[PDB]
C-alpha cells in the first residue's frame with residue numbers, strides 16, 4: 001500500500017522517463033493548492049523552480065489541518081501527506097526529500113520527509129501572522145531517470161491553462177535558475193482562454209460565445225470563437241485534465257455545433273439562397289474552442305486520460321450546446337451572419353471542388 005508507489009511509479013504519476021511524470025509531480029501539488037482556491041481561501045499560488053532541481057508550491061490558504069489524528073496518532077497533515085485516497089502522498093513517496101511547511105493559526109508548522117517517510121513528526125518551528133501551505137519537493141532520481149531537470153515551458157503552459165480553467169485564481173511561476181518569471185491571473189476564465197488562443201489570430205466576430213451550465217450532475221462550460229483562418233482548434237477538458245485525442249464531450253460539442261448551425265442556416269434561409277448543404281467540416285474551419293466539462297466519476301480510454309469515454313457527457317454537452325448556441329445565434333445576429341457567411345463560402349468551395357472532381 002505505502003511502498004507500492006515506489007515500485008510502480010508510472011502507474012500512479014505517469015511516464016517517469018519522458019518528463020510527463022516529473023512535471024505531474026508539480027501539477028498534483030498545484031491541484032491541491034487549486035482545490036483550496038476552489039474552497040475560496042487560496043487567492044494566490046506561487047510555483048517556484050529552485051536552483052537545486054526542486055519545485056515548491058507556496059499558497060496563501062487556511063493551511064493543511066495540524067489537528068492531531070486520533071486513530072493514526074500522528075497529525076492530520078502527515079495522514080494527507082502519506083495515506084493514499086492522485087494525492088500528494090504519491091508526490092511525497094517519489095521524492096528523495098520533501099519539505100512541508102504549514103502556516104495555520106499563528107504557528108509555522110514544519111516537517112521534512114525522505115522517500116515518503118518523515119524524518120521527524122510535525123512540530124512548530126516558529127510563529128507567524130500569515131496563513132498558507134508550502135510544499136517543496138526534490139524528485140527522486142531512483143524513480144525519474146532520463147528527464148530529471150524541471151522545464152519552465154511545460155510548467156508555464158499548464159499553470160497558465162489551469163488559471164483559465166479556474167476562473168479567478170493567481171498563479172505565479174518563478175525560475176531562480178535564470179530569473180524567468182510569469183504571472184497568470186486570467187479573470188475571464190475559459191472565455192479569456194479563447195481570447196489568448198485568438199490574440200495572434202484575427203477573429204471575424206467580436207462576441208465570444210460562452211456558457212456555464214449544470215444538467216443531470218454534469219457541469220458543462222464551453223467557450224468558442226471563429227477566426228479568419230481555416231484551422232480547427234478545440235481544446236477539451238474533464239475536471240481540468242486535458243484530452244489530446246478528444247472524446248465524448250468533443251463528440252457532443254461537434255454534434256450540437258452542426259445541428260444548431262444547420263438549423264439556423266435552413267430556418268433563416270441561408271442554405272436555400274446559397275444552393276449548398278453545409279457539413280460539420282465547414283463549421284469546424286477557423287474554429288477555436290474550449291470545452292471544460294465537470295464530471296463527478298468520469299471514465300477515460302486509458303490512465304493517460306487523453307480520451308473521455310463517459311457516454312453521458314456527450315448527451316449532456318450536446319443538448320446544452322443546442323439550446324445555448326441557438327440562443328447565442330439569435331441574440332448575436334451580426335456574429336451569426338459573419339460566421340454563417342464564412343461557413344457558406346467553405347460549403348460552396350468544398351461542393352464546387354467535389355463537383356470539379358466529378359465534372360471531368
Ligand SMILES: O=C(O)C(=O)Nc1ccc2nc(NC(=O)c3cc(Br)c(Br)[nH]3)sc2c1
Pocket residue numbers: 028029030032033036041057058059061062063064065088133134135
Ligand atoms: O474549512 C476549513 O476550515 C479548512 O480550511 N479545511 C481544510 C482542510 C484540509 C486542507 N488541506 C489543504 N491543503 C492545501 O491547501 C494544500 C496542499 C498542498 Br500539497 C498545497 Br501547496 N496546499 S487546505 C485545507 C483546508
